[PDB]
Amino acid sequence: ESETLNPSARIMTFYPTMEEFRNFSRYIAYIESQGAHRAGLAKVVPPKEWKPRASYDDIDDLVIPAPIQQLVTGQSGLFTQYNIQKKAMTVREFRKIANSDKYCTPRYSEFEELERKYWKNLTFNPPIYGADVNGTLYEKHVDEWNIGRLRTILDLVEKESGITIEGVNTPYLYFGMWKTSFAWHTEDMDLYSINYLHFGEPKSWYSVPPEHGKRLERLAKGFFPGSAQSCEAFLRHKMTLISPLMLKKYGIPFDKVTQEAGEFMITFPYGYHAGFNHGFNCAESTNFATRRWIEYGKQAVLCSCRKDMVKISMDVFVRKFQPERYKLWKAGKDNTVIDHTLPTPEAAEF
Numbered sequence: 600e601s602e603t604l605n606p607s608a609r610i611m612t613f614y615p616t617m618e619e620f621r622n623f624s625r626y627i628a629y630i631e632s633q634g635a636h637r638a639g640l641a642k643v644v645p646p647k648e649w650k651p652r653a654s655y656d657d658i659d660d661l662v663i664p665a666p667i668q669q670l671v672t673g674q675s676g677l678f679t680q681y682n683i684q685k686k687a688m689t690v691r692e693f694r695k696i697a698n699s700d701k702y703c704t705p706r707y708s709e710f711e712e713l714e715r716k717y718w719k720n721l722t723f724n725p726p727i728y729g730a731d732v733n734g735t736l737y738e739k740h741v742d743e744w745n746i747g748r749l750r751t752i753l754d755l756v757e758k759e760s761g762i763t764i765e766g767v768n769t770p771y772l773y774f775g776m777w778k779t780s781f782a783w784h785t786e787d788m789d790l791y792s793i794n795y796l797h798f799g800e801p802k803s804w805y806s807v808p809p810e811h812g813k814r815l816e817r818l819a820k821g822f823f824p825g826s827a828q829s830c831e832a833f834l835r836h837k838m839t840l841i842s843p844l845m846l847k848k849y850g851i852p853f854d855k856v857t858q859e860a861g862e863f864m865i866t867f868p869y870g871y872h873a874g875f876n877h878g879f880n881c882a883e884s885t886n887f888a889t890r891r892w893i894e895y896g897k898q899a900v901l902c903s904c905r906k907d908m909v910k911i912s913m914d915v916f917v918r919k920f921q922p923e924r925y926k927l928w929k930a931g932k933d934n935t936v937i938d939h940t941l942p943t944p945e946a947a948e949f
């Protein structure tokens with residue numbers, strides 16, 4: 600049944616009506632009923648009717664406390680990205696650097712050309728990413744798909760423990776410029792994420808189906824044996840860039856999509872993704888959960904080499920949503936096997 604929906608596991612694109620767009624968790628359940636999760640990544644174009652903010656003219660004063668310069672080293676489609684923290688600057692100052700002759704987008708025709716220049720010049724002229732800025736650009740009254748308050752069961756973490764985790768159950772803003780990158784990764788605790796491109800040049804994405812995630816990890820461990828030996832989940836460092844030609848050379852299934860201003864991207868549990876920005880832009884994102892995520896959370900393989908890494912206690916989720924398995928799980932005897940093709944239980948009504 601689920602196997603027969605999106606059998607190619609390609610990235611799907613949805614055009615919800617305003618009525619479908621009102622209930623967040625419901626529409627996520629719907630696109631899962633259509634097999635969208637199999638790609639690991641889906642695009643959602645909101646109704647033309649909709650807008651999270653009337654104007655972005657008031658934000659050039661917004662502070663980016665920790666701009667990051669992205670040093671990239673490597674060759675032959677394999678790279679490691681090193682972050683050099685720069686001193687705080689305003690959106691105004693960032694935009695100026697971004698559009699400057701030194702850092703601005705190169706001219707090009709088709710997307711494949713711009714993509715080629717990305718992989719050829721990755722290691723040159725390291726750009727600056729205005730990443731991980733705590734905040735939201737949603738107007739306080741927007742009640743549809745509000746990244747600040749999506750109301751999924753991820754809310755159980757703060758509700759139960761008072762714990763907030765920046766960018767995970769709070770919103771992050773990302774100011775891009777040409778050739779700024781996000782490395783191959785799944786989300787913390789293998790959660791969902793939502794990404795909204797407020798304004799500016801596009802953001803291009805690569806994705807690998809969850810059902811082939813393990814194959815990507817095996818490749819990554821082979822190419823980086825030192826890193827694999829020091830950490831049980833070194834891709835969570837988010838420093839590892841791998842070109843689509845390299846994935847193609849080693850038989851890893853993957854898809855590409857380009858995100859335009861005003862569009863949503865949804866990543867799904869255990870969905871590996873990576874990509875880059877085309878030029879000056881701004882994105883807002885956070886994580887979220889569904890009932891399906893819980894098993895993923897229970898089995899997520901975490902970074903073993905850093906204290907300050909993100910770790911959510913699964914206990915409250917197993918008690919409340921899997922009470923019959925709690926004893927078994929707590930005694931380490933819960934051998935549930937994840938089927939990456941099945942849609943979340945909330946999808947029943949479709």
Ligand SMILES: Cc1cc(C(=O)Nc2ccc(O)c(-c3cc(C(=O)O)ccn3)c2)no1
Nearest residue numbers: 682773780781786792794802836837872882
């Ligand atoms: C140092 C340091 C920290 C990070 C990081 O946490 N990055 C991160 C953490 C979680 C994510 O989901 C994404 C991410 C970022 C984007 C994007 O930048 O557009 C798109 C998709 N995923 C990126 N990268 O370098």
Ligand SMILES: [Mn+2]
Nearest residue numbers: 785786792866
């Ligand atoms: Mn991500």
Ligand SMILES: [Zn+2]
Nearest residue numbers: 830902903904
């Ligand atoms: Zn680690």
